[PDB]
Amino acid sequence: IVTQTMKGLDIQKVAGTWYSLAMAASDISLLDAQSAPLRVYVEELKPTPEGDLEILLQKWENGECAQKKIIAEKTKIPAVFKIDALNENKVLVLDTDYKKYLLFCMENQSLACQCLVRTPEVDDEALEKFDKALKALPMHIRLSFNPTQLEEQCHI
Amino acid sequence: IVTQTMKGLDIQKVAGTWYSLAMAASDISLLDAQSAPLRVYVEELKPTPEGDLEILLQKWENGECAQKKIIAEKTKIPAVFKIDALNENKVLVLDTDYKKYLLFCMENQSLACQCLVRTPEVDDEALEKFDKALKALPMHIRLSFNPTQLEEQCHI
Ligand SMILES: CCCCCCCCCCCCCCCC(=O)O
Ligand SMILES: CCCCCCCCCCCCCCCC(=O)O
């Protein structure tokens, strides 16, 4: 928890458009419902000059796919960020090649991880790396999305 | 779909108590909600003398974990059964060692598969066989349960 972070991460280089191709979580309840707590769909990453990371994502809330904006502040570790809210919340970058895929986990046990990809395409190779990275962890739900869903709001 | 069935299946030998240790499905919607269509928890298998298979399971329906009794009739293929209802529905036995684990899929595309085990224990070896069997298939949700859940009705 978690035993992989990426060495030599350049945060400025994860900038831009992402798709949440697959999500996994330690507890069924974290991803189960459409309004489930960690069931979130990444849209864009906006690294600040000071090295913080602004995240744009969608979440299903009322009975509606809602927009969100959250701030992840840098820590001393280049691959690890803290989310602004309660209580608190660590984001860890496990692996990325910047131009294709990015694996991250969010913890706080309580744990969810996603495979991000740059395009609305099923990347078998990034998915295989996501599954390799997660065999080490205690995940009890896993979801993956098809290209049609990846182009809809909240992957409907 | 599906490309593995078990050779030399003796149906009388799958008789008795089972636990649904892991479930996977082609479509998120088939397992997503607690009342989702293929979200079913196997309790016991009762093979008839004529080679049909009576299945006792639990399903979440009203706002309640309900009991069910379904009949799977034999076909010409020893590892494949047809479920009584609409419209219609094929059950295929992929692999079992009788005394520990049993892998099956239900189709009708539309596809769900489970890893059954004889005890409320996490069998890493049967799970690895379930994952091997499913790498071949187009699954978009996967769930697994812990021993505590396995001893509760509807794995709550
Ligand atoms: C490298 C960047 C990875 C992206 C990290 C995404 C972090 C998302 C964490 C959001 C937590 C849940 C937010 C839901 C807010 C709510 O409705 O309560
Ligand atoms: C070797 C035996 C494997 C066990 C096969 C279990 C088959 C279960 C299929 C049930 C289909 C869904 C039933 C729900 C009925 C409903 O509420 O509509």
Swiss-Prot record, chains A, B:
Role summary: Primary component of whey, it binds retinol and is probably involved in the transport of that molecule.
A GO CC term attached to the entry: extracellular region
Domain of life: Eukaryota
Record's comment on post-translational modification: Alternate disulfide bonds occur in equal amounts in all variants examined.
Quaternary organization: Under physiological conditions beta-lactoglobulin exists as an equilibrium mixture of monomeric and dimeric forms. Interaction with LMBR1L which mediates the endocytosis of LGB has been observed in PubMed:17991420, but not in PubMed:23964685.
Compartment list: Secreted
Similarity comment: family membership: Belongs to the calycin superfamily. Lipocalin family.
Mutation effect (Q58H): In variant C; found only in the Jersey breed
Tissue: Synthesized in mammary gland and secreted in milk.
Primary localization class, coarse: secreted
Coiled coil: none
Name of the molecule in the record: Beta-lactoglobulin
Disulfide bonds: C65-C154, C105-C113, C105-C115
Keywords: Allergen, Disulfide bond, Milk protein, Retinol-binding, Secreted, Signal, Transport
GO MF terms, alphabetically ordered: identical protein binding; long-chain fatty acid binding; retinol binding
